[PDB]
């Protein structure tokens, strides 16, 4: 109750290394994971259309090594592109977590870092993706100039270089987990096929 939301004052600090033959190899490691970030084609709204224009030929992002990839597993980056409603959010955590561990995030737009215009009087928007996953770089602006995304990638590339190779302990999950028996009466799934084969579509009632 003196400094709210405080910092924790760690001990046993980091035990970094200092030899040159390892830190040059660390520079190569970071340069390699750096200059070949492979995004995930994750589109939800006009931020994706600006990302599509970023793919284009007025200014690509194929240079400094970015290949738009379709699956998470091969990917390295979610340029979060659009609004995250409360019905697609687990379909974003299940894309982020379902991905290899040295992975990064960019949050383009204002509808996905505070909810933007939908940060008020909306009842189905997530007011910030930073309360779903660890955002690594923020860039503002509903539709931002897609060359601003390349500013964000510059700013992300000078953060991949800010990493170290004997520091990958801050890259896993601890899984502080529990269990609890309950009683909440499971219901059947009402979400199946049966859109035209249902009896009520082929049946004017009496």
């Amino acid at each position: 109750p003196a400094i709210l939301n405080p910092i924790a004052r760690p001990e046993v600090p980091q035990e970094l290394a200092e030899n040159i033959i390892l830190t040059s190899l660390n520079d190569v490691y970071d340069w390699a994971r750096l200059s070949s970030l492979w995004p995930l084609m994750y589109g939800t709204a006009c931020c994706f259309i600006e990302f599509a224009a970023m793919i284009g030929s007025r200014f690509d992002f194929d240079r400094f090594g970015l290949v738009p990839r379709n699956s998470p597993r091969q990917a390295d980056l979610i340029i979060t592109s659009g609004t995250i409603t409360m019905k697609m959010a687990p379909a974003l955590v299940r894309l982020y977590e379902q991905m290899p561990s040295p992975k990064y995030v960019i949050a383009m737009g204002a509808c996905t870092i505070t909810g933007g215009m939908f940060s008020s009087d909306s009842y189905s928007a997530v007011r910030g993706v930073d309360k779903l996953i660890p955002v690594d770089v923020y860039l503002p602006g509903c539709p931002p100039r897609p060359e601003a995304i390349m500013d964000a990638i510059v700013k992300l590339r000078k953060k991949i270089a800010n990493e170290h190779i004997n520091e990958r302990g801050n890259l896993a999950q601890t899984h502080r987990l529990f269990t609890a028996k309950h009683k909440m009466k499971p219901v059947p799934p009402i979400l199946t096929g049966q859109y035209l084969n249902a009896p009520s579509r082929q049946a004017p009632p009496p």
């Binding site: 109750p1 003196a2 400094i3 709210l4 939301n5 405080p6 910092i7 924790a8 004052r9 760690p10 980091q14 409360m86 959010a89 687990p90 955590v93 299940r94 977590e97 910030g128 930073d130 309360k131 779903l132 996953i133 660890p134 955002v135 690594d136 520091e167 801050n170 999950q173 601890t174 899984h175 502080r176 987990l177 529990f178 269990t179 609890a180 028996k181 309950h182 009683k183 909440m184 009466k185 499971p186 219901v187 799934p189």
Partner: protein, 110 residues
């Protein structure tokens, strides 16, 4: 199939983790408080979170097993964690990772 509530630093499921799988059982309700290490946990405050979860499932739940309800539980836990993190029991990790203040910046309580 699973019915989960995946916010940040609260992930709730409806199965039993055997070694890393989940195996939905319809009655175990696991939890995975703060996997990404946004916060630095003690032995006491974490037990308070555990007890909040236990007396929030059993004490008030007698209706269906929708994701709506688990999402509501996750919201109550993510507000309880604000309370613990404001009062000053736990704090941010400070490590050389992201350091994005999802919950809040530090105040002084004037």
């Amino acid at each position: 199939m699973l019915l989960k509530s995946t916010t940040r630093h609260v992930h709730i499921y409806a199965g039993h983790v055997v070694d890393g799988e989940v195996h939905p059982d319809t009655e175990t309700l696991t939890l995975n408080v703060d996997p990404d290490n946004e916060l630095e946990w003690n032995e006491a405050a974490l037990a308070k979170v555990e007890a909040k979860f236990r007396e929030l499932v059993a004490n008030a739940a007698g209706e269906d097993l929708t994701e709506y309800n688990l999402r509501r539980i996750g919201s109550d836990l993510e507000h309880f964690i604000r309370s613990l993190l404001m009062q000053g029991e736990i704090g941010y990790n400070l490590n050389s990772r992201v350091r994005n203040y999802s919950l809040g910046i530090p105040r002084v309580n004037h």
